[PDB]
Enzyme design. Sequence first.
Site, PDB file in Angstrom:
ATOM      1  N   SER A 116     -49.419 -10.965 -31.903  1.00  0.00           N
ATOM      2  CA  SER A 116     -48.030 -10.498 -31.782  1.00  0.00           C
ATOM      3  C   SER A 116     -48.044  -8.973 -31.680  1.00  0.00           C
ATOM      4  CB  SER A 116     -47.225 -11.098 -32.926  1.00  0.00           C
ATOM      5  OG  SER A 116     -45.842 -11.008 -32.667  1.00  0.00           O
ATOM      6  N   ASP A 233     -42.808 -19.709 -26.505  1.00  0.00           N
ATOM      7  CA  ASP A 233     -42.831 -18.573 -27.419  1.00  0.00           C
ATOM      8  C   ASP A 233     -41.561 -17.749 -27.244  1.00  0.00           C
ATOM      9  OD1 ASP A 233     -43.301 -16.097 -28.705  1.00  0.00           O
ATOM     10  OD2 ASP A 233     -45.463 -16.254 -28.262  1.00  0.00           O
ATOM     11  N   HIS A 263     -44.565 -19.401 -31.255  1.00  0.00           N
ATOM     12  CA  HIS A 263     -45.201 -18.089 -31.229  1.00  0.00           C
ATOM     13  C   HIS A 263     -46.503 -18.051 -32.027  1.00  0.00           C
ATOM     14  CE1 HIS A 263     -45.787 -13.872 -31.063  1.00  0.00           C
ATOM     15  NE2 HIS A 263     -45.349 -13.609 -32.281  1.00  0.00           N
TER      16      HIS A 263
HETATM   17  O1  LIG Z   1     -45.152  -8.854 -34.437  1.00  0.00           O
HETATM   18  C1  LIG Z   1     -44.199  -9.619 -34.487  1.00  0.00           C
HETATM   19  C2  LIG Z   1     -43.043  -9.408 -33.576  1.00  0.00           C
HETATM   20  C3  LIG Z   1     -43.221  -9.360 -32.178  1.00  0.00           C
HETATM   21  C4  LIG Z   1     -42.146  -9.162 -31.324  1.00  0.00           C
HETATM   22  C5  LIG Z   1     -40.878  -9.010 -31.879  1.00  0.00           C
HETATM   23  N1  LIG Z   1     -39.620  -8.801 -31.317  1.00  0.00           N
HETATM   24  C6  LIG Z   1     -38.844  -8.744 -32.345  1.00  0.00           C
HETATM   25  C7  LIG Z   1     -37.397  -8.531 -32.274  1.00  0.00           C
HETATM   26  C8  LIG Z   1     -36.605  -9.038 -33.311  1.00  0.00           C
HETATM   27  N2  LIG Z   1     -35.276  -8.909 -33.378  1.00  0.00           N
HETATM   28  C9  LIG Z   1     -34.682  -8.245 -32.386  1.00  0.00           C
HETATM   29  C10 LIG Z   1     -35.365  -7.698 -31.319  1.00  0.00           C
HETATM   30  C11 LIG Z   1     -36.748  -7.830 -31.247  1.00  0.00           C
HETATM   31  C12 LIG Z   1     -37.468  -7.210 -30.056  1.00  0.00           C
HETATM   32  C13 LIG Z   1     -36.602  -7.119 -28.792  1.00  0.00           C
HETATM   33  C14 LIG Z   1     -37.092  -5.880 -28.047  1.00  0.00           C
HETATM   34  C15 LIG Z   1     -37.971  -5.084 -29.011  1.00  0.00           C
HETATM   35  C16 LIG Z   1     -37.828  -5.742 -30.366  1.00  0.00           C
HETATM   36  O2  LIG Z   1     -39.404  -8.888 -33.546  1.00  0.00           O
HETATM   37  C17 LIG Z   1     -40.734  -9.062 -33.252  1.00  0.00           C
HETATM   38  C18 LIG Z   1     -41.772  -9.256 -34.117  1.00  0.00           C
HETATM   39  N3  LIG Z   1     -44.169 -10.650 -35.332  1.00  0.00           N
HETATM   40  C19 LIG Z   1     -43.338 -11.825 -35.644  1.00  0.00           C
HETATM   41  C20 LIG Z   1     -44.470 -12.257 -36.592  1.00  0.00           C
HETATM   42  C21 LIG Z   1     -45.234 -13.592 -36.465  1.00  0.00           C
HETATM   43  C22 LIG Z   1     -45.538 -13.454 -37.975  1.00  0.00           C
HETATM   44  N4  LIG Z   1     -45.738 -14.717 -38.685  1.00  0.00           N
HETATM   45  C23 LIG Z   1     -46.736 -15.070 -39.493  1.00  0.00           C
HETATM   46  N5  LIG Z   1     -46.559 -16.292 -39.933  1.00  0.00           N
HETATM   47  C24 LIG Z   1     -45.381 -16.656 -39.334  1.00  0.00           C
HETATM   48  C25 LIG Z   1     -44.746 -17.996 -39.534  1.00  0.00           C
HETATM   49  C26 LIG Z   1     -45.179 -19.155 -38.684  1.00  0.00           C
HETATM   50  C27 LIG Z   1     -45.600 -19.080 -40.120  1.00  0.00           C
HETATM   51  N6  LIG Z   1     -44.843 -15.742 -38.569  1.00  0.00           N
HETATM   52  C28 LIG Z   1     -44.226 -12.643 -38.070  1.00  0.00           C
HETATM   53  C29 LIG Z   1     -45.268 -10.987 -36.242  1.00  0.00           C
END
Ligand SMILES: O=C(c1ccc2nc(-c3cnccc3C3CCCC3)oc2c1)N1CC2(CC(n3cnc(C4CC4)n3)C2)C1
EC number: 3.1.1.23
Length: 289
Positions: A116, A233, A263
């Site tokens: 990610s 994803d 994801h």
């Molecule tokens: O790195 C990230 C990431 C990447 C892209 C993103 N995009 C947004 C985002 C959010 N809200 C508004 C907007 C956005 C984006 C739009 C444009 C720019 C920002 O958040 C992100 C986070 N992770 C998620 C993450 C997976 C981790 N995990 C570990 N275990 C679990 C569970 C299954 C057991 N999950 C938590 C690690």
Amino acid sequence: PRRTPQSIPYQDLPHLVNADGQYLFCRYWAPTGTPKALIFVSHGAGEHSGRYEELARMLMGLDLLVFAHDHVGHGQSEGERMVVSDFHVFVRDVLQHVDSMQKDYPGLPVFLLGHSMGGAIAILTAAERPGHFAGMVLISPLVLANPESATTFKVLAAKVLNSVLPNLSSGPIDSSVLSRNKTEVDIYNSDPLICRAGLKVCFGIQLLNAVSRVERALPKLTVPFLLLQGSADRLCDSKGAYLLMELAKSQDKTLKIYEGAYHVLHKELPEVTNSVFHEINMWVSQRTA
Ligand SMILES: O=C(c1ccc2nc(-c3cnccc3C3CCCC3)oc2c1)N1CC2(CC(n3cnc(C4CC4)n3)C2)C1
């Protein structure tokens, strides 16, 4: 004495002080014998290195020395939660830790594993040191954000970039889109070290910077890589995985698509997760023999 955000003295924990004077909490998984290679595990936004225990132990079982730290603002490292002055801080700090380990363990190949946001960090880390890393394992790396999320977030970003609005945040993501494995979702929702709050707009801007910088880095990227991506994803759009396969110059690049998977492939349904572990095992084994 200096303490983690959870009040544990850093003197009681493996750690590293970054170039900004901030303590990063570190993790190590070393084999009982001489390591064949080093591999740094780069976690994603909101989470922390403790989420990688099982993957790290698998890699250690392959006789690799696995190491990680919590990125600034995450887990047991210092910093305002989910704030970063510039995305490159994450890359700089990975490089510091890699350089420190290569001194203690000279002559070993070094791999990167990133999921990610941590996958975008891995891409940018390898692009900064062309020819230096032996390989990269990318689990749904942030190459393109979800197009719908990106569009609406960019509207919020416009407010923060044109006005002084230091506390503005996006709405929280629904954890159910992270994985079809409901038990893994419940575990993620129960971990006090995970920040599940809505993204602060300043941090999301840095994720937009990560996407822009990854795009410019692709035609320079030559490191071998294995790329694992779920077709469903909602965080890192699968189109970014296809674009990475097309635009990287790497001579050794492999993509595996998991049909219907969400994801977090290494915390997905057991059939997916078992395959993810097996594929990483084979890919790293073939490149450390
Ligand atoms: O790195 C990230 C990431 C990447 C892209 C993103 N995009 C947004 C985002 C959010 N809200 C508004 C907007 C956005 C984006 C739009 C444009 C720019 C920002 O958040 C992100 C986070 N992770 C998620 C993450 C997976 C981790 N995990 C570990 N275990 C679990 C569970 C299954 C057991 N999950 C938590 C690690």
